[PDB]
Write a structure and sequence with these properties.
Entry title: PRE-reaction complex, RAG1(E962Q)/2-intact/intact 12/23RSS complex in MN2+
PDB class: recombination/dna
Helix content of chain C: over 70%
Oligomer: part of a larger assembly
Keywords: VDJ recombination, RSS, RAG1/2, recombination, RECOMBINATION-DNA complex
Chains A, B: V(D)J recombination-activating protein 1
Organism of A, B: Mus musculus
Helix content of chain A: 40-55%
Order of helices and strands of chain C: HHH
Radius of gyration of chain C: 14 Å
Distance between the termini of chain C: 20 Å
Order of helices and strands of chain A: HHHHHHEEEHHEEEEHEEHHH
Number of helices of chain A: 12
Number of strands of chain A: 9
Bound molecules: manganese (II) ion, zinc ion
Structural class of chain A: alpha+beta
Chain lengths: ~350, ~600, ~55
DNA sequence: TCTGGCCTGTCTTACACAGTGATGCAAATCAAGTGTGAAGCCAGACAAAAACC
DNA sequence: CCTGTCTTACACAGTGATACAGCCCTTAACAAAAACC
DNA sequence: GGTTTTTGTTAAGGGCTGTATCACTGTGTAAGACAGG
């Protein structure tokens, strides 16, 4: 190739100035593109620019969690890629565990003003026993269930921090300020369902919340700075309590959920101050328990089973009445009326 | 270089036309290569060059297949990973799915060409043959016998071809390692293990049979010497048991088993009479095959060699003894069964040429009451030797605690109290939990001299302490033989003396342990006392997951349809067993 | 920088002037650390949290 | 035909063990410095180890 | 006529393989923006 | 304002790319006929 080498040195000294490295790289890249072979060209470009292909521990955590890879399987892939390219593209398992600590409840500090009634002020609280200290001695009622849950507030903290990037970008997109700290309001959807049979060859219940929308108070206007795009996707139904129990076993259901209802009730009466992007912000919460199918609504709002003549969970009608009177009914039931009527 | 693409193109277009001319003149128009040489020479003139050539920093598609198959990633999951890593580092670290499929074509049967001289009898000569229907054209009309199974298989020879090409790198490097020439093409000899087992229940809420072959060793003929250029290091690993036929059927369903397996037996029998020529490293090589069917547990051997079920009186699959005979004559038996003898004896049974009663006939044909259809090499494994010995020692311990050598008669209560005594004492002094059913590691832990000391702490007479210590010493003198991987090299004196030690063992049992004869004896004991040396000279050696493998592939890597799921599982299993990929998963070494 | 790293940077002048053609500062740091390096840990904590702020 | 003990066989309880995320300690590793060396590349006329008439 | 429990039924989640939508590239020949004097 | 580079356009089709799409079942869920009081 010496002859074309001397000819190219001539052409380069003619006008280019002798940095052949670059001109031979450009000639070869443009030839590769001419052969519609873009991939190899881009890889050469990245290797000549030297931009490092190292995935931050959080990206590896994302990939492992979203492809259901076990620690052992992820470790084999990690070690094999590292060994064969010599470069540590994926991070080792401990870096992932440490990146997980950030995304889980209990990592960030916060405060409640005023302090939450009957809720611990500790902020390092993580996974907690779902039984919430339920007596398990042979004398007391038998406990046949296992359950794990978060502290409801701790979960709300971690979730808000998880969508911090979307909150800031939504304020920007509404022409509002990044560091503005006015009273944000979060509408929180509560969901509960039994997951049917879980046995491998036994039922489960999932108590969850979805962050529905976050508004800010700017004047006498409530500017919508975030709204959940896919409100019924498993991607944003955030789990709060997982229990192995039957949605029809009333005793265990109330024993496991009452702690959560107390925490929630206590958060209805306070404002959460939490540090985002350097700026302390305040959050008010609106809890709307809407993610209850008919059967679970009737069980947890003291109504009769769905076969009864009292067909509406929203009104006092009877099957016969609602068949004779088609249209004219108003929404009249409410948690308070129902508590009263039990009395 | 700060310029854009149309700019760089226009600013260099004159040199571009000049170089295209210069390339068409003599190079032939592979401008890519001349520019690669130009840029590499430029880079050297001024590390980055080596990585550019590698694109190091780009994983070869076979490495991506290895990672993907070996981590059980679905295609969709693999793609999400690929696109996310690419999008975040800007570089194409993993290759896209079509590259993995294209690399998959190479490692699967049907890709490389070969020839059989002479051509294999009753086997098609096409070499592009991959996964084929395992029923092998079995009639499926409603009139015919009902087909409740689905099966997919390779053509046996095609599979062996793919296997040898998968291990080419190891074969060449083994020839180098033996001080031989890479290009030597003399007659290689491949010793191949055949294995068959049922994988129990596969149901997700249905049994399967797995027919496989393992490459055991490859020797070359260089002079009057057979030079071992390859030997499987881990012969009992799922990593090298290569799948050949997967069927959804019961190993006890003789009709479906024979219908699905007879085609494979025909292909193997025809490979017994030929030489495979196959091109490795540029040089055509010749291969002869020796098929040894050893991966058959007792039940499948008795089924495929026309013998009776395991409850029979003819306990040995290797000899004509009876349970009563093998309990009276402990040691002196030779291996006398062979596939041909069994075929003959079936014909004798079916024709009954001397007009005998059914009892007399069964005695004549020694329990061969069905027609064999697979020639096997039935053996035993290190496990069952320890097991048979432990069961006998445990019963001896019980009966030495009750002094049966002194008291002939005992009620069932007295025997249960002896066993309870021994169980409590072993729990107390040895920290061995009592077990209600025999098992491997229990045997492993009980057959020690320390436990003999412990149990002697419960026996009054010390002459029987001497008896037990000697008996266990003989057990420990024999054990290395059946447990080692190569007794010839690892304990030659133990092996030389094995026959003598088992003779003295049986004589001890027959003199100082008269009470422990009741006319019964186990397959494992009889084999352990009578056939261990002959088996070592036949095979060289003696020394629960396959179901999970099948299930996992079925769930996470298989189209959910009855005719493709089987071949999707078979393809993934083959990819899993390919050494070429396992080497990438052992790169860090 | 480690305590010993700031130490070695500070006393490369002495060992180089004494001997013009690492090992001597290595030894001295050795035998005196087995036996006042507090400001090196101070600076290390400062630079550590500074890099921590760096996102 | 009929109760009793042996028989092939289908059922049962049993017990190792495969793998999970977490754990904990050993061993790299990284980071500034500064005196070294080192494996491959630089040009041009021209002739051998390795293959075409 | 009922409250309620079992029954079978019917969409749908995802498997690997595969058709489909598509921006980049080629020829040559122009011209608008840009940037130095 | 001139003059050179940088960048863009036009067209008609081609090529690797990323993706919606394919056919395809088992499986969980819930409609609901029916059982039991
Ligand atoms: Mn429900
Ligand atoms: Mn078996
Ligand atoms: Zn209503
Ligand atoms: Zn025998």
């Amino acid at each position: 190739l010496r002859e074309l080498k001397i000819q190219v040195k001539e052409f380069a000294d003619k006008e280019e100035g002798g940095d052949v490295k670059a001109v031979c790289l450009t000639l070869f890249l443009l030839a590769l593109r001419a052969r519609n072979e873009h991939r190899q060209a881009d890889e050469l470009e990245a290797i000549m620019q030297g931009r490092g292909s190292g995935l931050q521990p959080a990206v590896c955590l994302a990939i492992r969690v979203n492809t259901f890879l076990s620690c052992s399987q992820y470790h084999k892939m990690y070690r094999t890629v590292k060994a064969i390219t010599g470069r540590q593209i994926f991070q080792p398992l401990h870096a992932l565990r440490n990146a997980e600590k950030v995304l889980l409840p209990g990592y960030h500090p916060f405060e409640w003003q005023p302090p939450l009634k009957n809720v611990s002020s500790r902020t390092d609280v993580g996974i907690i026993d779902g039984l919430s200290g339920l007596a398990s001695s042979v004398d007391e009622y038998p406990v046949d269930t296992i359950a794990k849950r978060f502290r409801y507030d701790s979960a709300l903290v971690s979730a808000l921090m998880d969508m911090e990037e979307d909150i800031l970008e939504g304020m920007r997109s509404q022409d509002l300020d990044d560091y503005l700290n006015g009273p944000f309001t979060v509408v929180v959807k509560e969901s509960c369902d039994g997951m049917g049979d879980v046995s491998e060859k036994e039922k489960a219940v999932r108590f969850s919340f979805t962050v529905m929308r976050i508004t800010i108070e700017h004047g006498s206007q409530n500017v919508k700075v975030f709204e959940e795009p896919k409100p019924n996707s498993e991607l944003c139904c955030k789990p709060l309590c997982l229990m192995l129990a039957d949605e029809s076993d009333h005793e265990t259901l109330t024993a496991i959920l009452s702690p959560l209802i107390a925490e929630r009730e206590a958060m209805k009466s306070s404002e959460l101050t939490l540090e985002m992007g350097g700026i302390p912000r305040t959050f008010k919460f609106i809890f709307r328990g809407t993610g209850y199918d008919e059967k679970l609504v009737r069980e947890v709002e003291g109504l009769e089973a769905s076969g009864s003549v009292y067909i509406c969970t929203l009104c006092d009608t009877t099957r016969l009445e609602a068949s004779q009177n088609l249209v004219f009914h108003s929404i009249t039931r409410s948690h308070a009326e129902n508590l009263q009527r039990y009395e | 270089l700060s310029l854009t693409r149309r700019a760089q193109k226009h600013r260099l277009r004159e040199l571009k036309i000049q170089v295209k001319e210069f390339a068409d003149k003599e190079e032939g128009g592979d401008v890519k290569a001349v520019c690669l040489t130009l840029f590499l020479l430029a880079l050297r003139a001024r590390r980055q060059a080596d990585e550019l050539e590698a694109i190091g920093s780009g994983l070869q598609p076979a490495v991506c297949l290895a990672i993907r198959v070996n981590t059980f990633l679905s295609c969709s999951q693999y793609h999400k990973m690929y696109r996310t890593v690419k999008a975040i580092t800007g570089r194409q670290i993993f290759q896209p799915l079509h590259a993995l499929r294209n690399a998959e074509k190479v490692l699967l049967p049907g890709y490389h060409p070969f020839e059989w001289q002479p051509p294999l009898k009753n086997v098609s000569s096409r070499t592009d043959v991959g996964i084929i229907d395992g029923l092998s054209g079995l009639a499926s009309s409603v009139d015919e016998y009902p087909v409740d199974t689905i099966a997919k298989r390779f053509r046996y020879d095609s599979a062996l071809v793919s296997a040898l090409m998968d291990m080419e790198e190891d074969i060449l490097e083994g020839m180098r390692s033996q001080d031989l020439d890479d290009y030597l093409n003399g007659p290689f000899t491949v010793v191949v293990k055949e294995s068959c087992d049922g994988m129990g229940d596969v149901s997700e809420k249905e049994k399967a049979v797995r027919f496989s072959f393992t490459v055991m060793r490859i020797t070359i003929e260089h002079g009057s010497q057979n030079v071992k250029v390859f030997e499987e290091p881990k012969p009992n690993s799922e990593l090298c048991c290569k799948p050949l036929c997967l069927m959804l059927a019961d190993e006890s369903d003789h009709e479906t088993l024979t219908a699905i397996l007879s085609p494979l037996i025909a292909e193997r029998e025809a490979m017994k009479s030929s030489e495979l020529t196959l091109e490795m490293g540029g040089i055509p090589r010749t291969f002869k095959f020796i098929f040894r069917g050893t991966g058959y547990d007792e039940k499948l051997v008795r089924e495929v060699e026309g013998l009776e079920a395991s409850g029979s009186v003819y306990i040995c699959t290797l000899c004509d003894t009876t349970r009563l005979e093998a309990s009276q004559n402990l040691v002196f038996h030779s291996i006398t069964r062979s596939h041909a003898e069994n075929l003959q004896r079936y014909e004798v049974w079916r024709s009954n040429p001397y007009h005998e009663s059914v009892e007399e006939l069964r005695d004549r044909v020694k329990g061969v009451s069905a027609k064999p259809f697979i020639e096997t090499v039935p053996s035993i494994d290190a496990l069952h030797c320890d097991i048979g010995n432990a069961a006998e020692f445990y019963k001896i311990f019980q009966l030495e605690i009750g002094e049966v050598y002194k008291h002939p008669n005992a009620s069932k209560e007295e025997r249960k109290r002896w066993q309870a005594t021994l169980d409590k004492h072993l729990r107390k002094r040895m920290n061995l939990k009592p077990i209600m059913r025999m098992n491997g590691n229990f045997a492993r832990k009980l057959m020690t001299q320390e436990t003999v000391d412990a149990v002697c702490e419960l026996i009054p007479s010390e002459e029987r302490h001497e008896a037990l210590r000697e008996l266990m010493d003989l057990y420990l003198k024999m054990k290395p033989v059946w447990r080692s991987s190569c007794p010839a090299k690892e304990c030659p004196e133990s092996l030389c003396q094995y026959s003598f030690n088992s003779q003295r063992f049986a004589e001890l049992l027959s003199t100082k342990f008269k009470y422990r004869y009741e006319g019964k004896i186990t397959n494992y004991f009889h084999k352990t006392l009578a056939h261990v040396p002959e088996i070592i000279e036949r095979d060289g050696s003696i020394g629960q997951s396959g179901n999970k493998l099948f299930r996992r592939f079925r769930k996470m890597n298989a189209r959910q349809s009855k005719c493709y799921e089987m071949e999707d599982v078979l393809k993934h299993h083959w990819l899993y067993t390919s050494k070429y990929l396992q080497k990438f998963m052992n790169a860090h070494n | 920088p480690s305590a010993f790293f700031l130490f070695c940077s500070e006393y490369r002048p002495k060992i180089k002037g004494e001997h013009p053609g690492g090992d001597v500062a290595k030894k001295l740091g050795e035998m005196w650390n087995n036996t006042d390096k507090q400001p090196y840990e101070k600076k290390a904590a400062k630079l550590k949290e500074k890099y921590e702020k760096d996102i």
